[PDB]
Amino acid sequence: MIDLYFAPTPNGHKITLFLEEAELDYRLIKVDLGKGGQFRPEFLRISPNNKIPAIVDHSPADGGEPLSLFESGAILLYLAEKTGLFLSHETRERAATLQWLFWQVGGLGPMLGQNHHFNHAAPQTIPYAIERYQVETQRLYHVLNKRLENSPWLGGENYSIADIACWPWVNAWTRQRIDLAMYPAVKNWHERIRSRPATGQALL
Amino acid sequence: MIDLYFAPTPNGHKITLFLEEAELDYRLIKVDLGKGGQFRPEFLRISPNNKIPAIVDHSPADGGEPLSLFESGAILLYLAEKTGLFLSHETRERAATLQWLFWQVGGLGPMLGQNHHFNHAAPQTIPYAIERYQVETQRLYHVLNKRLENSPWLGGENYSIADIACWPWVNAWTRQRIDLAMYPAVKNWHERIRSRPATGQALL
Ligand SMILES: N[C@@H](CCC(=O)N[C@@H](CSSC[C@H](NC(=O)CC[C@H](N)C(=O)O)C(=O)NCC(=O)O)C(=O)NCC(=O)O)C(=O)O
Numbered sequence A, B: 001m002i003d004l005y006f007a008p009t010p011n012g013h014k015i016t017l018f019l020e021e022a023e024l025d026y027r028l029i030k031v032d033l034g035k036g037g038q039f040r041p042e043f044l045r046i047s048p049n050n051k052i053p054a055i056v057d058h059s060p061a062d063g064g065e066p067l068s069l070f071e072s073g074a075i076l077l078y079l080a081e082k083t084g085l086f087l088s089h090e091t092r093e094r095a096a097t098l099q100w101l102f103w104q105v106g107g108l109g110p111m112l113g114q115n116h117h118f119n120h121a122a123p124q125t126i127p128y129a130i131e132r133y134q135v136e137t138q139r140l141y142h143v144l145n146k147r148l149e150n151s152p153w154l155g156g157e158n159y160s161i162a163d164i165a166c167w168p169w170v171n172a173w174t175r176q177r178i179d180l181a182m183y184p185a186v187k188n189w190h191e192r193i194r195s196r197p198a199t200g201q202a203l204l
């Protein structure tokens, strides 16, 4: 049993995707981010960076006490290692997978997040910053599409944690002033993953 | 032999640190970022996201053709896996290490980078954005210090790729309008890693 500390967000949805895909037992423990749930001391012990997602794995493979982890990327990696699923053990495909996973974590998510912030959250309008993060979103979707033109999935021939990590951010394209049709390979990969049974399950 | 595609930056320095620490043969292939080196087509084949660092590993453990990787985090992980060094194989320490590695890649580096951008690069002064990234830098150094108060290294008792990934960003504190003395645990960890022989070697 995995407890997932969760708010309905792209980053939270990365973990429900994986959990449904891997067929792992879990429950959702809602964290209320508008009401400062993420600063509750006993959450900060689970997740010191004050963010969701975080998990508590009640059955760690060493059979010890529960294990807490934060950071969507490290949760996906830890769960891919634990299950043997959605991350290859072959050196080249594994490396390519990890590369795009770190790419999503360092680039896609931080930059689209700044985009969501300046366009849908900031008190006052900051044209330099809106332009700066809009151009970067486009570059990021161009990088994403470039790869998906050459490979069916980001790591090679198999669906992996790299695709799982990006999908919920692409799925918020409507909030990013992105026309998904400008990136046909992204558009197809997006619909392909939308129609996977586990994604369906996570979206209920 | 590892070729490292490199510019003198925090992100580039993560890889020289590791390489010196692991005692791996490598050469530096300078990429000129002010002159658009990162858009040269044969670099973009190595590193499609148009960034350094990237490596070409000429002796991959499978004995195949050279293997290219981009993203500092995936390079460190790939090299830690390949060498068996600076990332634990014990489940809990490994997970804690990876957590802080992803934390650096998703938070520390993107946010300090935005900080360096608005304070030392942007054409015009954007007070909302300068304030936004300055507060976030402080929060990030507070998270970093909080951890280093409770553990000697970010992953547990051993120096690891989590520390290697953060160190060059902390080492640019003078560019961030950060008083390192406000974060004593960070200050000590910083000097401790400055004085390691391999860091010394990488700084020549
Ligand atoms: N690197 C972490 C990021 C986790 C994260 O961003 N969590 C958010 C909710 S996801 S929803 C997306 C999230 N935005 C936000 O959290 C909005 C509030 C924020 N402080 C702001 O002003 O931008 C974002 O932009 N993320 C960028 C990224 O994924 O790298 C959170 O718990 N926030 C609590 C808080 O901020 O107090 C991961 O992958 O787990």
Ligand SMILES: N[C@@H](CCC(=O)N[C@@H](CSSC[C@H](NC(=O)CC[C@H](N)C(=O)O)C(=O)NCC(=O)O)C(=O)NCC(=O)O)C(=O)O
Pocket (backbone or CB within 6 Å): A102, A103, A106, A107, B007, B009, B010, B011, B012, B033, B038, B050, B051, B052, B053, B070, B071, B072, B073, B105, B109, B110, B111, B112, B113, B114, B117
């Ligand atoms: N996530 C990647 C980031 C790699 C990266 O940022 N590389 C930089 C040089 S490191 S030096 C630090 C880097 N800044 C820059 O590259 C400055 C130029 C930039 N386009 C801007 O306007 O901010 C930065 O802020 N990084 C944030 C982070 O680490 O997440 C690069 O090659 N830039 C070429 C280009 O931009 O065309 C990784 O970990 O490898």
